[PDB]
Amino acid sequence: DFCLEPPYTGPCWARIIRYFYNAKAGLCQTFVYGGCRAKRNNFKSAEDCLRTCGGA
């Protein structure tokens, strides 16, 4: 379950704010994504995040 995976910034050096489902808190949170090699627990909005992982 990718929704249980921790956020992955990746090797690139951009500072792009994305969302990830934090199963411990039961909500989607923001994290800094570097710009490349995103994993699946990486969303552009909280709604997308809740729709895909909400309640995992």
Binding site: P11, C12, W13, A14, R15, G35, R37
Partner: protein
């Protein structure tokens, strides 16, 4: 920029900030209407901010100009990160604090000292984004050592720069920024392994290999 120094207000006139509600990447002004940055910095709704020092407060010298077009290199590979270069056309020309940087006539050699600038994180182990622009002098490293630091990951379009000891490097928020050597734009901040680690120098897009594509692309757009 980890381990660098405050450049000084508008001392790096070709440095731009790519803003999408917040600073997410840097870039270089190569002419009044064009900016060069990294392909992984591609985003919709980009606003380019020029004449910036403290990116958090308006100080007068700024020019915010929306991007009209964003051209990512046709061969950019998001998996291998090869061809990590992108051109952004400004909606209107900038009034040249704000100046363009020259493209390179030839590739730079290992040992060459270069200036790397950006508003990225300044802490290797932690987080601290500066208000003002940070600068860092770092030498270009040999293709051999670069390839030793990143086994089977370096292509002919990338070069390493920095220090093996660690402590001085680019970091989150510096992507797309300039690596200027001898007054010419030689690199684009691209990727690394964390920040300022270590035996893990930063990896940059080798601009000298794209000069023709850049010139022809700017002219026909």
């Amino acid at each position: 920029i980890v381990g660098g120094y405050t450049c000084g207000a508008n001392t790096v006139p070709y440095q731009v900030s790519l803003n999408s509600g917040y600073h997410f990447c840097g870039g270089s002004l190569i002419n009044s209407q064009w900016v060069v940055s990294a392909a992984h910095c591609y985003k919709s709704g980009i606003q380019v901010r020029l004449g910036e020092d403290n990116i958090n407060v308006v100080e007068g010298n700024e020019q915010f100009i929306s991007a009209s077009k964003s051209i990512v290199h046709p061969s950019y590979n998001s998996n291998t990160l090869n061809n990590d270069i992108m051109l952004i056309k400004l909606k209107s020309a900038a009034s040249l604090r704000v100046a363009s940087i020259s493209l390179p006539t030839s590739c730079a050699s290992a040992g060459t000292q270069c200036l790397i600038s950006g508003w990225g994180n300044t802490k290797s182990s932690g987080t601290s984004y500066p208000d003002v622009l940070k600068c860092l002098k770092a030498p270009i490293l040999s293709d051999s050592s670069c390839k030793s630091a990143y086994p089977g990951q370096i292509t002919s379009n990338m070069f390493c720069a920095g220090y093996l000891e660690g402590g001085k490097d680019s970091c989150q928020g510096d992507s797309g920024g300039p690596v200027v050597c001898s007054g010419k734009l030689q690199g684009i901040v691209s990727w690394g392994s964390g920040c300022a680690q270590k035996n893990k120098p930063g990896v940059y897009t080798k601009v000298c290999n794209y000069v023709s594509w850049i010139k022809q692309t700017i002219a026909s757009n």
